[PDB]
């Protein structure tokens with residue numbers, strides 16, 4: 398029952414599924430962190446997704462790493478609805 | 494079954510086309526031909542003419 402983000406439904410318009418955007422795995426070992434990036438663009442009734450992942454090893458929660466990296470597109474979305482606000486989500490099961 | 498052809502039931506399916514501007518997500522096919530090389534040809538690759 399983790400789908401606590403939404404409780405009510407309505408008519409749906411687009412139901413694409415694919416491989417998860419976060420393919421980085423922590424099962425190898427620790428001591429390095431992920432650097433997920435995402436750029437969202439909504440123009441002429443379209444939507445684009447760009448993402449890259451690189452290791453950092455050192456955490457240093459102060460600033461982004463000093464390095465250049467290209468960001469290739471992942472998927473293109475043909476939904477042409479108005480967008481004005483951004484909201485993110487978290488994963489929290491219980492106190493532990 | 495004994496009723497006349499005019500009185501017989503006909504299953505009717507009606508298709509409505511709404512040319513909405515934004516999505517344009519679904520429509521019909523587009524046939525592709527064979528490939529030739531080393532010849533001066535007019536190519537149309539995914540809309541690139």
Ligand SMILES: *[C@@H]1O[C@H](CO)[C@@H](O)[C@H](O)[C@H]1NC(C)=O
Pocket residue numbers: 477478479480
């Ligand atoms: C909402 O979208 C419609 C059609 O896409 C457009 O006419 C209208 O200006 C938009 N409104 C806002 C606030 O974006």
